[PDB]
Amino acid sequence: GPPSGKTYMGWWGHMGGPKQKGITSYAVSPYAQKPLQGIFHNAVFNSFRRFKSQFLYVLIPAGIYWYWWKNGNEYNEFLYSKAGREELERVNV
Template sequence: MTGAHHGYMGWWGDMGGPKQKGIVTYSVSPYAQKPFAGAGYNAIFNTFRRVSSQIIFFAVPIGTYVYILNQAKERNAFLYSKAGREELEALS
């Protein structure tokens, strides 16, 4: 059996190959980090940037809705007036 594993090779990172050299890792203590550094600044300006890039997607439907709603209210007010009732009677 060529290429087959004959037994346990070792845990991950220690599989019997040559040792790696020249790899240096650094870490910062979680107590030395500032988890909320710049959170307020980023919250304001990130929110503005995201909303301004998406405004067309909610401003147009809201504007259309408000326009249609105002037209419907005006039409309803007209139909409940004396002139509106006369117009409806003339149509029927």
């Protein structure tokens, strides 16, 4: 077939990565292993580690936008009451 343009990923055997030497990789068949090894230790401790490291980046913007939405919604519910109709006309024009 037509040999098209080279990319940054080949196939198995010539993957285009750097040449490596001296990196031994030991593994064990799963039939010799126990699956669910340490699911309660890693369910209590490692999940708390990940939640501890990555919750401020999620909860500070969620806190900002939720407080903005709650303040705006309760201001609108204040304005369309009876104690804000002069403020309703003043905000209109």
